[PDB]
Design a protein around this ligand. Structure first.
Ligand SMILES: N[C@@H](Cc1c[nH]c2ccccc12)C(=O)O
Ligand SMILES: N[C@@H](Cc1c[nH]c2ccccc12)C(=O)O
Ligand SMILES: [Mg+2]
Ligand SMILES: [Mg+2]
Lengths: 673, 661
């Protein structure tokens, strides 16, 4: 998109250029330094996204000393960080008491304890910071809340309750201080969010203080006949998962859209009956709709899904990112429901939220669907009998009449082809996959009922669509994008089966976290995902809070790493996904050439498998999972992909077995016709 | 301006990771360009550096490498090959790209290195991630390996002549350490290279493997009557002070040069006799002359001073920096001898270097002078091998000075200043001439930055320990602000007490700290983003009169920033003013009630190569009209005791007060 402009007002002080350095290093762009006696009229504040008001002698109660800093705070309407004289400036300009502190403190350290909010995010409490002031903010007004204090018992941080203003008495940039660059990066982040915060719909919200069983909500509130979505936290775990979302295509503002890579056409079905056909690329279409149909996030909600698109992005959409249209999927290459009406379960607090759109102007009785569905939900609330889920094992095949595309022998060959390509330095890691087909007369909901019981996960889902049903028991987070523009990705790479005992379970759990091979498989994907995000994130923002964590589910142990970043200004949430699609964890590195190797060897499409599935909110947030451990149901057969990382140290036979281990949950669900 | 880096993408999934690290390290994001661009249409001459990204395949195939190839061979720019780039530099210069003993993909290695170029400041070992089956085996003589892996593979190389660097690891990888450091080193190596490319003179040089007594050289070779210079390392500690420099104005091409702030007039007097008075701001003029009189650094010299201007910068020149023209100096505000001929002592290796300038396509007896002068030495080398005083009148007496300190404390309480370097100025009638008194002074106080300027309007007799600015030709800057003083102890046990005391005192550390920040600020206005840093902090150095708390700061000049501009942006030294400098200097103006002149200025040399070495002017005696003027002072802060800070100034004068008696 672009980088962010930062203005740095100099109050003819002898520290301004230190702030210049720290802003430069933290944000990856140098600030524009202007003197405080500069002409505001002439100054093009239009072309700036943040201001920093430098330290300086004297007080802000003066035209000299402070000057044009005053305008930045009152008028500009922009994110501002006051430092020392600026911090003091914020106080008096909103009616604050800037008086003599107990002890003047020049070129001297204080321990600073703080909330950890805004400009103090990430910082430990306390930390060390150099002070340069006799004056100090004392009695704060009602508009300003303090964030940090000195050991001296003095205000070291503050902000405005409404406006995007921030202050520090201490000097981040001073050589005696710690976490200067962090603070400057925090302020960058705040400004990015602020700017991202700047509707043809009217969103009605309704809370119900009952929590039925999610399966009871699916069966009770939604129909078997019709297009339905169920985003299912079959596993609920504080921090990891909390919510479930359900809806259908019966509303008056709902739509259903497919895409074909081969045609290159967006087919969409209005609530009218109308069936439009554009010749677009899907990510382009999606970006536009999301921009046009924007809606702000409702504050009462504990989540940022305020309706929008729910569905899946197929692997073959790589054709319109960085890949080639090599193979043509049987199923849609994209497929979503525009959800105008949705039921949202909060497993943590034990309540429901109903959400429905009206057009800004006209009614469309969406408030009717609130009060009706509320009374339905109350009638479905009963004691769910606690039923612990058993872990699974290894010891074989892909099911009785299940035909793998590549049989074992064929796969062991393609593993060897992968191994050749790595020697010749064409890829470092190849995520080669198979595709198993198997007949089943089973309908989606009974079969999903079985799957979710076998393998409860944070990112399960049942999509019942006209062309196909997608029965996902995915544990994998692809992209979680805040409306504020924060991004998280948690690539899974590093698989291990569950232990037959509880001991051997810890043994495999520990082996997976310790092995060089698996850590390497994981690391290479971390770097690849950091790359994808760095393409559309702000410089400094991309980082890795956690590396080589082991998560455990009924079917398997997984090695997971967490990557985070913050979107650049102008970068839409859909741009961010296009940048990262397909996910590194399903392709390998380097992506482009790896995906070419995949095209030759797999000799056919992955379809929905390998893609992403989840939601894009009108708030601009998204939550997407990697499609793995997923059964695609269509035309009387069940299709499911399984894969694995092929690396220098891979063993043909062991890798083949890994694909089977992964098929277990799907294979067990299908068992019993 | 800021340095512009080109990153050549080789369709690899780590290019935007390099983008990130360059952005954070250099403070400026690279312009990314795919490997299949067009060399001509591409304006390579706009950029200052190239980072060649990794990739799949080989540097051989065009598929994989493309325009990167031409970046190394043709561009003539600084280049950093990362992985495939590193593999390309090996091969392009006739080296071998062969199979490594084990393919290493996303796997760490302990890298051990020499600490050179892209590895500067990094520990050995450090951890780095690898992504390659192939590795450099046979390096040409053109190429030189800098780093090695724990399995004995080449991890880093350079070209000996051209400014190429390769690393066979991924600094940008999450599993690697010191990635950002490496990208900064490359930025620094790129800045340096361009400053080496930026003539009216020929430079002749002659070494002589004998070392006479520094003082005797001054007596013998230089005259007592002329206008000479003597940059004197009266203290010679290894890696801290090594050289001494002497000359005179008995050259064809030599010039004396003076400036007055009042007039705004540069006054140059050639050896012809006739002067040439120009109305121009000094630093501008000095910058301009050093541009036109550029002379490449001689490589057989261990020092960078390849002749140039030797002299001082008076305090009052602040009027052209960030200060006001409040007071006229009795003395010239700048006084520089353009040295076309110089003797240079190397105290470490025990030899002399003679330097002399002939005009290009002319002969002015340089080589004739080198033999004459070098011969003279050899003979002398065997003969001689290696309170304020009685009639002294301070500007402010004690009572007055105490009341001026009070004013400082009041301005500090108001918050007009965080620290004020208040100074007094003692004058005293004396009988002695220049060389006899300096002889006493240098013996009393051996220091690294001693100096004896013997100019017409004044003699300067410095016993400065302090460094102000040491700028390289490569554009690297150092500054060691002294702030925090202590007397010596009577015995050896007393010295330890005081050494420890000075180190630990919160008051002193704060005094020093505020200057560190101030100097960082000044350097940052002229230096590359990320380049400014503080290797040492609150180091204590011991000299015959005092123990001094010293902190070291470094940086890199931006492209198109003259060494003169750097001196301008740092002048006067925060050491001698306090922060914030502008406001503090106005306070100083009001209270001191007169000029510092030479005192608290800078003294040293500006080389034709673009180097410089400037001391702060303290522990110094000016001579003019049979009168010895010396300045003393110290930092005033909120914690300052009036009576104590006065005593500090008397202690600081002991060397000067001793030398006169
Ligand atoms: N687990 C998510 C919601 C969710 C469940 N299944 C999903 C599938 C795709 C996307 C999101 C989801 C939460 O707790 O917030
Ligand atoms: N000690 C310096 C030279 C030097 C001695 N006295 C000086 C006075 C001013 C400037 C430089 C000097 C060196 O080692 O190179
Ligand atoms: Mg620090
Ligand atoms: Mg594997």
């Amino acid at each position: 998109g672009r980088h962010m402009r930062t203005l740095l007002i100099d109050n003819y002080d002898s520290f301004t250029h230190n702030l210049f350095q720290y802003i430069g290093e933290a944000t990856g762009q140098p600030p524009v330094v202007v003197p405080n006696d500069a002409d505001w009229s002439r100054l093009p504040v239009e072309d700036f996204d943040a201001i920093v008001v430098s330290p300086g002698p004297g007080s802000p109660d003066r035209e000299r000393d402070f000057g044009i800093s005053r305008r930045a705070i009152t008028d500009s309407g922009l994110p501002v960080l006051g430092v020392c004289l600026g911090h003091q400036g914020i106080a008096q300009l909103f009616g604050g008491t800037v008086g003599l502190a107990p002890e003047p403190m020049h070129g001297r350290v204080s321990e600073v304890r703080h909330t950890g909010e805004d400009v103090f995010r990430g910082l430990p409490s306390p930390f060390t910071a150099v002070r340069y002031h006799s004056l100090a903010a004392t009695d704060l007004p009602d508009e300003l809340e303090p964030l940090a204090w000195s050991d001296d018992g003095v205000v070291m941080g503050l902000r405005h309750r409404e406006k995007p203003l921030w202050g520090v008495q201490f000097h981040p940039e001073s050589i005696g201080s710690d976490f200067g660059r962090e603070i400057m990066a925090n302020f960058r982040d705040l400004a990015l969010a602020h700017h991202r915060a700047r509707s043809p719909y009217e969103l009605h919200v309704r809370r119900v203080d009952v929590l039925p069983d999610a399966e009871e909500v699916r069966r009770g509130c939604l129909p078997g006949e019709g297009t339905t979505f169920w985003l299912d936290s079959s596993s609920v775990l504080e921090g990891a998962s909390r919510f479930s979302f359900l809806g259908d295509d019966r509303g008056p503002l709902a739509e259903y859209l497919t895409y074909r890579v081969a045609d290159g056409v967006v087919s969409v079905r209005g609530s009218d009956g109308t069936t439009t056909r554009t010749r677009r690329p899907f990510f382009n279409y999606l970006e536009e709709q999301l921009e046009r149909r924007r809606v702000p996030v409702a504050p009462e909600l504990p989540f940022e899904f305020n309706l929008g698109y729910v569905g899946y992005l197929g692997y073959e959409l790589k054709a319109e990112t960085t890949g080639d249209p090599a193979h043509r999927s049987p199923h849609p290459d994209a497929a979503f429901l525009f959800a105008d009406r949705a039921i949202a379960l909060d497993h943590q607090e034990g309540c429901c939220y109903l959400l429905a759109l009206d057009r800004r102007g006209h009614d469309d009785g969406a408030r009717a669907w609130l009060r009706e569905t509320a009374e339905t939900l109350t009638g479905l609330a009963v004691r769910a009998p606690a039923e612990p889920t058993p872990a699974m094992v290894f010891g074989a095949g892909f099911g009785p009449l299940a035909r793998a595309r590549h049989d074992k022998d064929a796969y062991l060959k393609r593993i060897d082809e992968c191994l050749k390509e790595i020697r010749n330095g064409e890829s470092y890691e190849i995520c080669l996959t198979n595709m198993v087909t198997a007949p089943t007369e089973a309908t989606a909901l009974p079969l999903y009922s079985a799957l979710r019981a076998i393998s409860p996960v944070p990112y399960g889902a049942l999509l019942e669509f006209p062309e196909l049903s997608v029965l996902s028991a995915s544990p994998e987070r692809f992209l979680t994008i805040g409306a504020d523009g924060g991004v998280e990705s948690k690539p899974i790479k590093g698989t291990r089966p569950r232990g037959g005992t509880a001991e051997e379970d810890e043994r495999l759990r520990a082996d997976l976290a310790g092995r060089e091979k698996d850590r390497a498989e994981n690391l290479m994907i971390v770097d690849l995902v950091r790359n994808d995000l760095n393409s559309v994130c702000a410089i400094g923002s991309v980082h890795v809070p956690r590396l080589f964590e082991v998560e455990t589910y009924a079917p398997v142990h997984q090695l997971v790493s967490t990557i985070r970043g913050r979107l650049r200004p102008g970068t839409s949430t859909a741009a961010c996904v296009r940048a990262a699609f397909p996910g590194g964890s399903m392709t390998g590195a380097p992506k482009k050439r790896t995906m070419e190797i995949i095209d030759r060897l797999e000799e056919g499409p992955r379809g929905v498998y390998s893609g992403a599935l989840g939601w894009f909110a009108l708030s601009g947030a998204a939550d997407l999972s990697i499609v793995i451990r997923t059964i695609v149901l269509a035309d009387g057969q069940a299709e499911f992909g399984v894969g694995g990382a092929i690396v220098s140290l891979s063993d043909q036979e062991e890798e083949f077995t890994e694909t089977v281990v992964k098929a277990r949950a799907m294979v067990t669900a299908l068992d019993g016709s």
